[PDB]
């Protein structure tokens, strides 16, 4: 691997379907913050349990803001401009949900640390 694991947490990822005005699940598994040892850039990489198929692959852009979801005290929603899980870089409204408020707050802390590393 050309990357170092900064943070690893179990999570469920959703993308908002604007047409059906509903959240659709994208995968469940280990959400990883990966630091590229050549560029020092940190991405989110998330793989599905058992299939190991990628459900998230994007840079933690400094311009991203984690917002609460009205339904949850253990979730964040953010716009992503360029995710390449399914191939061609696409824009998504993501929601990621954790086991606990504590995991969610820890995730927010780590995501901010990654934004600051990505500002360099």
């Amino acid at each position: 691997e050309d990357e170092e694991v900064l943070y690893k947490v179990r999570a469920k990822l959703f993308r908002f379907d604007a047409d059906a005005k509903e959240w659709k699940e994208r995968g469940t598994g280990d959400c990883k913050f990966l630091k590229n040892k050549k560029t020092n850039k940190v991405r989110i990489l998330m793989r599905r349990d058992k299939t190991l198929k990628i459900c998230a692959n994007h840079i933690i852009a400094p311009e991203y803001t984690l917002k609460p979801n009205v339904g949850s005290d253990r979730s964040w929603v953010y716009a992503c401009t360029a995710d390449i899980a399914e191939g061609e870089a696409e824009a998504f409204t993501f929601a990621i949900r954790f086991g606990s408020k504590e995991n969610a707050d820890k995730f927010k802390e780590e995501f901010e640390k990654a934004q600051e590393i990505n500002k360099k």
Binding site: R10, A11, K12, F14, F16, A18, K21, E22, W23, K24, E25, R26, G27, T28, N36, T39, K41, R43, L45, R47, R48, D49, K50, T51, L52, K53, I54, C55, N57, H58, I59, A61, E63, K67, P68, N69, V70, G71, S72, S75, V77, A79, T81, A82, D83, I84, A89, A91, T93, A95, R97, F98, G99
Partner: protein, 209 residues
Amino acid sequence: QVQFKLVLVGDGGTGKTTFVKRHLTGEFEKKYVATLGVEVHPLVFHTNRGPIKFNVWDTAGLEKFGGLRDGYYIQAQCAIIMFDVTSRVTYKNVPNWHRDLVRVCENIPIVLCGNKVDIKDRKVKAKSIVFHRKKNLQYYDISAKSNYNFEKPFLWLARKLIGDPNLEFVAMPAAAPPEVVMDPALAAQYEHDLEVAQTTALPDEDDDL
């Protein structure tokens, strides 16, 4: 890359479409929308022996939406027969689906799947499920909803069709994702769309994730 036609059969509402959709997009569809005849979707897995593609023929289980029926089974190379462990009639009908399938496809690998093992009040007990034995079907308890054994039917069929018993699903390396600049012209667009999404609740807020 090798592509194999896979036919999915079983009673209406057993979870055929829900199971395939979970495999295609990752999503769990809660609504029952009965399949009309057949839906065909390519499904790719990455293995230690390279990629395998299933051309999935997800057929209608309701008689009135049956369409071509066994017309869908022609030149199938593998199959899943689905029932619902919460519905005895769906297991009672497994011999009927099997009969119609093997009359068209004489010598193919077939998995029998008891779906919805996530539901506490199971009606088709483990002891009752024996139809697979004399028919040489693989059997798995699955849940499209909890993902219990959700990969097992495809892994078993892939081992049978490639003819390598030690074949595994692997993670493909993840390409470095692009760095883009947020367009100042669509900035107003995105705050709107984020407003709608923050104020729509995530489903299943009582689950472990």
